[PDB]
Structures are given as C-alpha cells and as structure tokens.
Amino acid sequence: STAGKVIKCKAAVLWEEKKPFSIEEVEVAPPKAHEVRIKMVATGICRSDDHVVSGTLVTPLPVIAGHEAAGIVESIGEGVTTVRPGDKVIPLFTPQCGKCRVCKHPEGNFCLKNDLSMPRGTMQDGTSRFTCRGKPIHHFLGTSTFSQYTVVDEISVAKIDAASPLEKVCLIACGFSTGYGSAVKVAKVTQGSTCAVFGLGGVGLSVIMGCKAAGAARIIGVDINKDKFAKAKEVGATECVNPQDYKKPIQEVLTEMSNGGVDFSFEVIGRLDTMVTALSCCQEAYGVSVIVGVPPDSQNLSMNPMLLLSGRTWKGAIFGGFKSKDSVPKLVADFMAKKFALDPLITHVLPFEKINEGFDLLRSGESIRTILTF
Amino acid sequence: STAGKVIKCKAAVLWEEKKPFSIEEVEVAPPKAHEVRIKMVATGICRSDDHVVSGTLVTPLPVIAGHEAAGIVESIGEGVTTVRPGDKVIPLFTPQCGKCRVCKHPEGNFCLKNDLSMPRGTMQDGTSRFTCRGKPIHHFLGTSTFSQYTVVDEISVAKIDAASPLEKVCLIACGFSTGYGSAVKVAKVTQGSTCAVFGLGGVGLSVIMGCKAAGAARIIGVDINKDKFAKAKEVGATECVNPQDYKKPIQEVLTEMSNGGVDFSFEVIGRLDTMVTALSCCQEAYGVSVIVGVPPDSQNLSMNPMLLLSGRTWKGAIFGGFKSKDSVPKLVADFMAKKFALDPLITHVLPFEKINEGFDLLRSGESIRTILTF
Ligand SMILES: NC(=O)c1ccc[n+]([C@@H]2O[C@H](COP(=O)([O-])OP(=O)([O-])OC[C@H]3O[C@@H](n4cnc5c(N)[nH+]cnc54)[C@H](O)[C@@H]3O)[C@@H](O)[C@H]2O)c1
Ligand SMILES: NC(=O)c1ccc[n+]([C@@H]2O[C@H](COP(=O)([O-])OP(=O)([O-])OC[C@H]3O[C@@H](n4cnc5c(N)[nH+]cnc54)[C@H](O)[C@@H]3O)[C@@H](O)[C@H]2O)c1
Numbered sequence: 001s002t003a004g005k006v007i008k009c010k011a012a013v014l015w016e017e018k019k020p021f022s023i024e025e026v027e028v029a030p031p032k033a034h035e036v037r038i039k040m041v042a043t044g045i046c047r048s049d050d051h052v053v054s055g056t057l058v059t060p061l062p063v064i065a066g067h068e069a070a071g072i073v074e075s076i077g078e079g080v081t082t083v084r085p086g087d088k089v090i091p092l093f094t095p096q097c098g099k100c101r102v103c104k105h106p107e108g109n110f111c112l113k114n115d116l117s118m119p120r121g122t123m124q125d126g127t128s129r130f131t132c133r134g135k136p137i138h139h140f141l142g143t144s145t146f147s148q149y150t151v152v153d154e155i156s157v158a159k160i161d162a163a164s165p166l167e168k169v170c171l172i173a174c175g176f177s178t179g180y181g182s183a184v185k186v187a188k189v190t191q192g193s194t195c196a197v198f199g200l201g202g203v204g205l206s207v208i209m210g211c212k213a214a215g216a217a218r219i220i221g222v223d224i225n226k227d228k229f230a231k232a233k234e235v236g237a238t239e240c241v242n243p244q245d246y247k248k249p250i251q252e253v254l255t256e257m258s259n260g261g262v263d264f265s266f267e268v269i270g271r272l273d274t275m276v277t278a279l280s281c282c283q284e285a286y287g288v289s290v291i292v293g294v295p296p297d298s299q300n301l302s303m304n305p306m307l308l309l310s311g312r313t314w315k316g317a318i319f320g321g322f323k324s325k326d327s328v329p330k331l332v333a334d335f336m337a338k339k340f341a342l343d344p345l346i347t348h349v350l351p352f353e354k355i356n357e358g359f360d361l362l363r364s365g366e367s368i369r370t371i372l373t374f
Numbered sequence: 375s376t377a378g379k380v381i382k383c384k385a386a387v388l389w390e391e392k393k394p395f396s397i398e399e400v401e402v403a404p405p406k407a408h409e410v411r412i413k414m415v416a417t418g419i420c421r422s423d424d425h426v427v428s429g430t431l432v433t434p435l436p437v438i439a440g441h442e443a444a445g446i447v448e449s450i451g452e453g454v455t456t457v458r459p460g461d462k463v464i465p466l467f468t469p470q471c472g473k474c475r476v477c478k479h480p481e482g483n484f485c486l487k488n489d490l491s492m493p494r495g496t497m498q499d500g501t502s503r504f505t506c507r508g509k510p511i512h513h514f515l516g517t518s519t520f521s522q523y524t525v526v527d528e529i530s531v532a533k534i535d536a537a538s539p540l541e542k543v544c545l546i547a548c549g550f551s552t553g554y555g556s557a558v559k560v561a562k563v564t565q566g567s568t569c570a571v572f573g574l575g576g577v578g579l580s581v582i583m584g585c586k587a588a589g590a591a592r593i594i595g596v597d598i599n600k601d602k603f604a605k606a607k608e609v610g611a612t613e614c615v616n617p618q619d620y621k622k623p624i625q626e627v628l629t630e631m632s633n634g635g636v637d638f639s640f641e642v643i644g645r646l647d648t649m650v651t652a653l654s655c656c657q658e659a660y661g662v663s664v665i666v667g668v669p670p671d672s673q674n675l676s677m678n679p680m681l682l683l684s685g686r687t688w689k690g691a692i693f694g695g696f697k698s699k700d701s702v703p704k705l706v707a708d709f710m711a712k713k714f715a716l717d718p719l720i721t722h723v724l725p726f727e728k729i730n731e732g733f734d735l736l737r738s739g740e741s742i743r744t745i746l747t748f
C-alpha cells in the first residue's frame with residue numbers, strides 16, 4: 001500500500017553545523033530504477049556522524065546523516081534483483097558496484113561510486129529522495145540512516161540473514177567491521193605479535209577484537225580517557241596507557257615497552273598528531289601502521305619520510321578493507337554462529353527520538369555505541 | 375707480507391662538505407677481532423655518496439666515503455669464520471648481524487647494527503682504523519670504499535663467487551640490488567601491472583629492470599632530464615614523461631595515463647615533493663608507493679592522510695629490502711647465471727685517481743654509474 005507512493009515519516013535533519021538534530025517530518029520519494037526503500041529498525045551513532053555536526057567531515061547541508069544501520073525493505077524500484085520487500089538489509093556506506101576497477105581488484109574495496117572522497121550528498125543519479133519543509137535535503141554516503149525510511153541505490157545495500165537481530169547487527173554496517181577488518185585484513189596482524197591501538201571507542205575496541213582473533217600476544221590500548229581501559233581489557237587489551245601520565249611522548253613510551261617498536265599500530269581517533277605518533281611507534285624496519293581515524297577536513301600532516309625509508313609500511317582503509325556487499329552478509333552469518341561478539345560495543349540503547357541524547361553521551365565520553373531503535 | 379701491519383695506501387678523503395675529495399696517503403690499521411681488511415678492486419659512484427658532499431646526508435667528517443664496491447680480502451682478525459684472505463667480497467653498507475630482532479624477522483633487513491640512522495662513522499667498537507696526516511678519519515656506513523684498502527666488521531662483508539667480475543658486480547653492493555629489490559621484494563610488483571618510476575638514474579633503472587622481471591605490462595619512467603629516457607626504454611620503460619612538458623601536475627598526468635592511477639609507484643630521486651607526487655599517482659584504493667630516494671636531512675614533508683585512508687600503501691626501504699649478507703652472494707650468483715644485466719647501468723669507467731671527475735659526470739647529468747678501478 002505504500003509502494004510507489006511518497007512516504008511521510010520522521011527523520012533527524014541537520015540544518016546547520018554545531019546544532020542539535022531536528023526530529024521532524026520529511027517526505028521520502030519512492031525508489032527509482034535500481035533503488036531500494038528501507039524501513040529502518042536500528043542505527044548506531046558513529047563518531048563519523050558527529051564529525052558531520054562538528055565540521056570535521058564536510059558534506060553538503062542540510063542533510064540526513066547516519067550510516068551504521070539495519071532495516072527491512074519496504075519496496076524496490078524497477079530492475080532491482082538483489083533484495084526483495086520484507087528482506088532484512090544493511091545499507092552500505094561504501095558501495096560495491098561490482099563493475100569498476102576497484103571492485104574487480106582482489107584487494108580493492110573503495111568502490112569508485114562512493115560519495116566519501118568528494119561528497120555530493122545525493123543518490124547515484126545526482127538527485128535527492130528527501131524533502132523537508134518543502135526543501136530538498138542531502139543524503140549522506142548514499143545511506144542516510146537517521147530516518148524512519150531511507151532510499152538507497154542497489155549497489156549500497158546488502159541482504160542479510162532473515163533471522164538477524166537488527167539491533168545488534170547494525171554495528172556490522174560500520175564500527176565493528178571497520179575495526180575488525182583493519183586488524184585482520186588490512187594490517188594482517190600475526191600470531192604472537194605486539195599491537196598498539198590508539199583510541200578505545202567502538203572502532204578501536206573492534207580493532208582489539210581483531211588483533212586478539214589474529215593471536216597477538218600483546219595488545220596495548222592507548223587513550224587519554226582512562227574510563228575506556230576496563231572495556232578495552234575485557235575485549236583483549238593486555239595493558240592500557242594514557243599519554244597524559246607520561247613526561248615523554250607516547251611513541252617513545254611504546255617503543256620502550258615493546259623493546260624497540262610494535263609490530264602493528266592503529267590510529268583510531270582522527271588526529272594528525274596521533275597518525276604520526278602511531279607510525280613512529282611501530283618498529284622502524286618491519287612495522288606496519290594503519291590509519292582508521294577520519295582526519296579533519298583539508299588538513300595536512302607533517303612527517304619525516306625517514307620513518308618510511310627504514311622499512312615501515314603506512315596504510316589506511318575504509319570499512320576495514322571489506323568489499324561491502326560481499327562481506328556484510330558473511331559477517332552477519334559469522335555473528336549468528338558466535339564467531340565474534342557485538343554486545344561489548346553496545347553501552348546504551350535509546351529510541352530514535354532521543355538521538356540528541358545519544359550524541360551527548362558520545363561527546364561526554366560516556367558511551368561506546370548507543371543503538372537507536374525506530 | 376702486509377698482514378698484522380699498518381698499510382699506507384691511497385684514499386679519497388673528504389675533509390669538509392662541498393669540497394672535492396683529496397686523493398692522498400692514509401694509514402689503515404690491521405683488523406682487530408671479527409674484522410676484515412680488504413684490497414679494493416672497483417667502486418661505483420652512488421648519488422648517496424654525493425649527498426655526503428652536498429650536506430643532503432649528515433655523517434661525521436672528515437670521512438672516507440664510498441659504499442658500492444667489491445674487493446679481495448687481504449687479512450682477517452681473530453675469530454672471522456665467513457671470509458678468508460684471497461676471497462672476493464662485497465662490503466655491506468647495511469650489515470646483517472644475524473642476532474637482532476630485525477635480522478631474525480622474515481621481512482626485516484635494516485639491522486640494528488647499522489650506522490645509517492644515527493651515524494657515528496666508526497667500526498662496531500666505536501673506533502676508526504684510518505688516519506691521515508696524523509688525524510683520525512671517520513668510516514662511512516661501516517664500508518669506506520673510496521680507499522685502496524678498508525677494514526670492515528665481519529657482519530658488513532659477504533663472500534662472493536671467486537670468478538666474479540668485480541668491475542661489474544660492485545653494483546650489487548648498492549644501486550642494482552636497491553632498485554631491483556624495491557620492485558620485486560618491497561613493492562611485490564605483479565604481472566600485468568602498471569608502474570611509475572620517478573628518477574631514471576642507476577637506481578631508477580634498476581627499479582625498471584625489477585618491474586619488467588616481475589611482468590609489469592606498463593612501466594612509465596618520469597624524469598626532468600629527457601636524456602635519461604633512451605636507456606630507461608632499453609631496460610623496460612614502455613613510456614617516459616618529463617613533468618616540465620606539462621601544464622598539469624604530473625600526478626594528474628599519470629592518473630589520466632593509467633585510467634585512474636598506477637598499481638605501483640617508486641620515488642627514486644630524494645625530493646619531498648616527488649615522494650608525495652609518487653604516492654598520489656598510485657590508485658587510491660589499492661595502489662602501493664615505495665620511497666627509495668634519500669630525503670634531505672631533517673626536512674618533513676606535508677601530505678593529506680586521506681591519500682592513505684582510501685586504501686593506498688606507502689612504504690620505504692634500504693637496499694631493496696634484501697637481508698644483505700644472505701642476499702649479496704645469491705645476487706652475484708644470479709648475475710653469473712645471466713639472470714639480469716649490469717652493463718646498462720655502467721656509462722663510464724675511470725681510474726680511482728679520477729674520483730672527482732666521476733662525481734662531476736654524475737652532477738652534470740651525463741652519467742648513470744661511473745665505476746672507479748683501483
Ligand atoms: N576508516 C573507516 O572506515 C572508519 C569507520 C568508522 C569510524 N572511523 C573513524 O574512526 C574514529 C574513531 O571512531 P569511534 O571509535 O566511533 O570514535 P570514539 O568513540 O570517539 O573513539 C575515539 C577515542 O579516541 C580517544 N582520544 C581522543 N583523543 C585522543 C588522544 N589525543 N590520544 C588518545 N586517545 C584519544 C577518545 O577518548 C575516544 O575514546 C573516528 O575518527 C571515526 O570518524 C573511520
Ligand atoms: N634506499 C636505498 O637503499 C638507496 C640506495 C641507493 C640510492 N638511494 C637514493 O636514491 C636516489 C637515486 O640515486 P641514483 O639513482 O644514484 O641518483 P641519480 O643518478 O642522481 O638519479 C636521480 C634522477 O632523478 C632525476 N630527477 C631529479 N630531480 C627530478 C624531478 N624533480 N623529477 C623527476 N626526476 C628528477 C635526475 O634527473 C636523475 O636522473 C638518491 O636520493 C639516493 O641517495 C637510496
């Protein structure tokens with residue numbers, strides 16, 4: 001009965017940077033060819049969503065943000081073959097078109113149809129499916145999950161197990177998969193190795209999970225908020241350090257602790273200084289450092305390339321290096337089979353209507369993941 | 375007999391930066407325990423030696439430079455087991471102690487006994503075997519090949535094929551092995567790939583040789599000196615481009631040429647700007663860039679970490695990633711078995727007494743490798 005019709009529903013609209021979300025009615029157009037309209041069930045609050053508010057991440061405004069979610073297909077546009085109405089699905093903030101040079105490459109996942117490099121805030125066809133107060137509203141990363149209903153391109157949705165608990169598996173849409181893949185896929189952490197993880201939020205805890213899964217002997221968590229240490233130890237940290245406790249820079253402390261540098265380091269914060277510190281603290285001849293955190297818009301870091309000439313490897317990744325549409329259903333299946341845990345990331349649950357409280361919890365330092373229910 | 379005695383011989387002493395070498399008599403002490411004294415046969419002129427003259431590289435002066443050589447063992451100190459008097463040998467500017475965490479690591483080569491990071495310009499025991507006009511003279515990288523005789527620590531020498539032509543295989547001591555290994559071992563260039571090589575000197579040409587041996591389909595040479603293009607094509611470059619011919623930055627040109635970025639790029643110059651250009655021209659999701667060129671002392675580059683967050687890998691290496699004492703004898707064996715060529719790198723052969731003329735050929739752009747013969 002809603003198929004082919006505009007849906008009026010509530011969404012969280014961001015009209016201006018550095019302001020609360022406005023929970024208000026929007027109009028959601030029906031899906032066009034190769035589009036899917038989804039009734040959202042659950043969405044996480046990721047620090048990247050907060051970056052849109054802060055202006056750390058620049059995307060066109062006004063916008064419907066949100067990218068870490070799961071829901072149920074309401075309708076499909078003409079030509080959709082990969083999902084049907086009533087399927088559980090995860091929107092993919094990194095698409096998988098399956099046709100570009102990246103999608104065809106065995107190690108590529110940053111599909112060329114993404115809306116991350118140079119955000120337009122549209123559907124693939126350059127238009128918007130959202131109206132609010134009679135004004136067009138931007139999409140975000142082709143997902144826009146802070147809405148009771150969204151419309152996504154087919155290449156930005158994956159069908160998942162019909163028995164999935166959506167209020168848990170929404171974390172597979174960003175923070176778990178990112179952190180876990182950054183360790184197991186991107187860094188390829190080895191058994192018996194020493195790892196350092198900068199930032200112990202939902203993504204850095206997920207990095208720890210992956211390092212533990214990979215068999216690391218030592219996993220050193222690094223955060224300026226010591227309240228984050230207990231959960232980091234629960235999921236696999238062997239020791240935690242707060243840079244503020246030390247007179248010396250933490251790259252020197254970590255080099256000492258690891259008897260000459262760590263095997264693998266991860267930046268999971270989004271600071272230029274900790275990206276350089278994390279590179280420096282990995283062993284100079286064979287160490288690997290992975291950037292996961294989102295840097296502030298248009299800012300350059302400064303570093304000495306001798307850090308690389310000695311033998312270090314420096315890399316970054318989006319979404320843990322996972323090809324998104326292939327990987328999300330497998331990761332859900334693996335969760336179903338208890339191959340990893342999501343509950344340690346979930347610290348708070350709120351209704352969608354309390355989104356602003358959920359952001360307040362992230363900004364205060366209290367939460368890891370708040371899951372919003374529609 | 376010379377064994378156990380001070381040798382008075384000829385050497386090229388560098389008394390201060392930005393001056394010609396002084397060809398004069400030095401005294402060479404006999405080797406102490408675990409040291410080897412070598413009669414030099416041939417040495418190449420590597421740009422890194424020029425860096426010591428120019429102040430691009432800081433190392434204690436006065437000094438006997440030179441690091442790309444081969445010779446014949448004159449005598450051995452107590453406890454040497456790996457070479458004997460009369461053996462052909464290559465001094466190793468990156469040692470292989472075999473005992474440190476790097477030497478024990480399957481992918482490490484930058485042995486902690488090296489004299490590159492924080493140069494002392496001595497033997498392992500912190501003393502010098504060289505004097506000139508009554509003054510102690512520094513070693514360089516544990517090698518000091520610009521001398522009729524040197525003394526090296528055993529961990530800094532490899533025994534090579536007794537039938538080796540030392541006037542050719544001296545290039546395995548630095549420039550061939552560095553470039554070749556940078557392609558085949560550090561980048562791991564793939565069959566069918568597209569590579570970009572910045573800098574078409576002896577090292578860059580050896581990178582091309584490696585990229586061709588690895589089966590690359592396209593190898594784009596980049597140099598501001600178009601006189602370097604003909605030899606680059608002879609050894610495998612499919613295209614050459616001079617940045618100076620273009621209105622656009624060369625990263626844009628190379629991105630366009632490669633239909634979205636190269637698979638592998640190499641910086642083989644030693645400039646901060648070309649290190650960032652080389653990173654940028656590799657494909658953003660799966661590209662790999664390797665820094666080979668030695669940067670100027672204490673200078674930082676500026677870059678946008680989004681270049682890495684999309685998926686690029688950035689790495690550097692010394693000596694092509696090769697564990698030096700294991701690798702150099704095998705490389706010489708492979709050359710003897712016609713597995714690669716060295717003659718394309720040798721443009722000039724001069725007596726040692728013409729060292730200054732050899733440096734002038736390098737600085738003017740004319741030469742690739744000048745070999746000095748003792
Ligand atoms: N690459 C991707 O695909 C991807 C995916 C998800 C998130 N992100 C980014 O990853 C980062 C972490 O996200 P999250 O886990 O949701 O955020 P979060 O919950 O804010 O966690 C960040 C942690 O960093 C800690 N921190 C802040 N400053 C410092 C400091 N100077 N030193 C040490 N610790 C410090 C902070 O206390 C917090 O616990 C953010 O920048 C996200 O935008 C990237
Ligand atoms: N990593 C190692 O182990 C290692 C070993 C050997 C050499 N090196 C370094 O590698 C670099 C190359 O050494 P080499 O081949 O003997 O030197 P070289 O013979 O001077 O070659 C450098 C080339 O770069 C070209 N060039 C200069 N500026 C530019 C520019 N802006 N854009 C493009 N091309 C440019 C120049 O014309 C020349 O052909 C030097 O910095 C060495 O110190 C490092």
Ligand SMILES: OCc1c(F)c(F)c(F)c(F)c1F
Nearest residue numbers: 046048057067116174294318
């Ligand atoms: O948290 C995932 C995430 C990113 F990794 C980004 F790089 C980005 F720009 C963004 F908007 C985003 F949501």
Ligand SMILES: OCc1c(F)c(F)c(F)c(F)c1F
Nearest residue numbers: 420422431441490548668692
């Ligand atoms: O050409 C080899 C070479 C290097 F790669 C350096 F990094 C360096 F400092 C040096 F002195 C050297 F000779």
Ligand SMILES: [Zn+2]
Nearest residue numbers: 097100103111
């Ligand atoms: Zn694609």
Ligand SMILES: [Zn+2]
Nearest residue numbers: 046048174175
């Ligand atoms: Zn996210």
Ligand SMILES: [Zn+2]
Nearest residue numbers: 471474477485
């Ligand atoms: Zn060693």
Ligand SMILES: [Zn+2]
Nearest residue numbers: 420422548549
């Ligand atoms: Zn050299």
